[PDB]
Each structure stands twice: as structure tokens, then as C-alpha cells.
Design a protein around this ligand. Structure first.
Ligand code: CU
Ligand code: CU
Ligand code: NA
Ligand code: NA
Ligand code: ZN
Ligand code: ZN
Lengths: 153, 153
């Protein structure tokens, strides 16, 4: 399989390690790991365009969107490539992440390697919020932690 | 063109921002930026195989070496793809990095996106140190700071 990894860090207590695996060319990508330091409940979770952390997570730019689509949820046909929905933190502030996605890839034009994974302050409304930002950012708010997605062994 | 960036961090603080630019896929990569917190003199400087910072810079693995060649300096034919030689810190501990390299790339199979840039404790002996480690690591010693190479705007 092709593999990737990301260490999430930010200005506050949110930190984690997320793994990626793609067993087959153009096959599903498994995304799994843990993030701690979160408020209980849903937090938006996306791949952003740039693997630039020079001024922290803001430097990563907008969601990764090579097809020029509107923001959506991962189950939607209308979504950005980087739209991975929400992760859910428990009462202790820990999110056990376990996602399978076939829109992201670890090779080719939808490759996420060298881009930034971000976990947000608020839940992502998946493009269903009824204001104009919903179909751009999902109203997920501030960026709590992020890291560049790297090739793994 | 075509751009990448890397934020180097380690204890000291040893820290820096390194930029990469490649005008065309058949052209060289310019590598430039600044690193502070270093001891005066030469420090080894390489791209390592994995963009994995899970346990700090050790997790990046060996030098990026897809052709399975011996370690060398950047001018040599027999070198690892990731072998960028040394950077030089002044009396204030600052290295102004300015490299052009024709063996690394920002696309294709020598692509360094998603890999780790590392600056070392010791100078790299460029494979001419006369012990067996010389033609593996250049005897550059510990890893002072590193970061994953990300796609830049
Ligand atoms: Cu996001
Ligand atoms: Cu090195
Ligand atoms: Na969802
Ligand atoms: Na040299
Ligand atoms: Zn989006
Ligand atoms: Zn080497």
C-alpha cells in the first residue's frame, strides 16, 4: 500500500496523529488516528490546498478544491476534494478518527501529500447552512491544529 | 513554476523557513531561506525519505535515495537524491541558505514534496571521510531541526 502520515499541532491544546493508507491505485484511502484536546462533539476536518505552516494553520489557504466545486460533506457528489466532514470528540476531548474516502488520493491530481490537514473549532455544516460561507468553508470556524501530510514508510 | 516550503523546527530553538522553486519540470530547483540557532560553521542538509515527524526528526528515516546510490556531495554523480551538502551558519548562528540543485525536483519520481528536510549537528563530509558511515550519512550526526516539505502557493 501507499501510506502517508500527519502530525496535528496548533497554538492550543489540540494535537494528534493521523495515518493514511491506499492499498490500490485509485482505490479507497483509509484515514485513521486520534486527536486530543478537543471540545466534546463534532469538529470540521479537511485537507487545505497548501502545505505551508509558516504562520500556523492560516497559511494553508482554502480547502483543497482542484475541480472548482462547492463545499460539501464527504458523502456528497458536490464537494471539494479536501472535504472529509467532521470528527467527533468524546467527553475527554478525544476523537478516534476512522474514515474511508475515495475522492482523496495518495497519488495523481487528487493527491493530498504535501498539503495540510486541519481540524476546526466548530462543526462543518456540510454546505447545508443556508448562508454563503456554508458552501465555501462549512462555517467550521477557526483552525485549532494542522500539519503537512507526509509520505510514510 | 512549482513552489514548496518547509518550516524547520528543533530544540535550541533551531528554526527556519526554507523555500523551493522550480520554474519548469526540466529545470533546477532553487532552495533558499534562513535558519537560526545553529553553531557557527557548516551543518549537513538533506532531504530524508519520509515526511513522518511522529517522534521528531528520527522518524524521517534515511536520506532520500530512490536509486540506491552511495552518499555524496551535491556536485557528485554518485549521491543520494536528497544530498544537498552543507549550509553555513555565521557567528550569530544564522545560515542564509541559497542552493540550486538539478537532482531534486518538485514533481516526478525525484519529487521531494511530502518528504522531510533536515539540518544536522555536524558538517556532512560528502562521502569522503574514509569510514563506512561517510558513504551513508556523511557523518553529519544528530538531527537538529526538520520539517515536512509542503506545496506552496
Ligand atoms: Cu478546514
Ligand atoms: Cu540528513
Ligand atoms: Na457527514
Ligand atoms: Na559541497
Ligand atoms: Zn470544503
Ligand atoms: Zn545522503
Amino acid at each position: 500500500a501507499t501510506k502517508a502520515v500527519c502530525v496535528l499541532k496548533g497554538d492550543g491544546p489540540v494535537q494528534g496523529i493521523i495515518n493514511f493508507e491506499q492499498k490500490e491505485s485509485n482505490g479507497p484511502v483509509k484515514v485513521w488516528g486520534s486527536i486530543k484536546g478537543l471540545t466534546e462533539g463534532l469538529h470540521g476536518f479537511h485537507v487545505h490546498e497548501f502545505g505551508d505552516n509558516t504562520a500556523g494553520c492560516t497559511s494553508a489557504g482554502p480547502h483543497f478544491n482542484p475541480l472548482s466545486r462547492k463545499h460539501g460533506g464527504p458523502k456528497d457528489e458536490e464537494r471539494h476534494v479536501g472535504d472529509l466532514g467532521n470528527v467527533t470528540a468524546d467527553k475527554d476531548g478525544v476523537a478516534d478518527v476512522s474514515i474511508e474516502d475515495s475522492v482523496i488520493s495518495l497519488s495523481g491530481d487528487h493527491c493530498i501529500i504535501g498539503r495540510t490537514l486541519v481540524v476546526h473549532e466548530k462543526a462543518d455544516d456540510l454546505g447545508k447552512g443556508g448562508n454563503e460561507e456554508s458552501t465555501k468553508t462549512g462555517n467550521a470556524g477557526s483552525r485549532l491544529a494542522c500539519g503537512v501530510i507526509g509520505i510514510a514508510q
